[PDB]
Amino acid sequence: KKISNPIIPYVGTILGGLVPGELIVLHGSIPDDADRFQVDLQCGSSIKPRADVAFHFNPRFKWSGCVVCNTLEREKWGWEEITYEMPFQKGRPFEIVIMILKDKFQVSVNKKHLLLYNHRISLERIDTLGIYGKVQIKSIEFVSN
């Protein structure tokens, strides 16, 4: 459950799905000209109709920067939860750690807390990791309890 230099866009099955207490650990970097990227925890990888996204984590670099989180269900976006922080920096490496909990995802970037997001889709439905946009990824790891 460790992938080196994945191709972006990345779409891959999460072996065994996710359980509370586990981590998803991403090391990567942001290109000099980035606008946004996203990490999506998905129900499958269908394109038409588009796979549900249980957790859409979407850093956006415009202005002072923010991170938009949401859920896509039956091809409709829910209410956005926007964190007006930007820990990502153009031209710099990062580490993202997503801690899976019973109630929430908790996300840290570079070992600093970033945000919480309550589950909207049942955790057991998630079977696919997608990474899209202007981002480079050195490694993907799923860390057990």
Ligand SMILES: OC[C@H]1O[C@@H](O[C@H]2[C@H](O)[C@@H](O)[C@@H](O)O[C@@H]2CO)[C@H](O)[C@@H](O)[C@H]1O
């Ligand atoms: O909510 C996540 C998605 O947002 C979409 O953009 C929104 C935008 O944030 C919102 O303010 C409004 O203008 O509608 C847009 C379209 O739904 C993105 O296009 C999408 O990729 C997700 O990030």
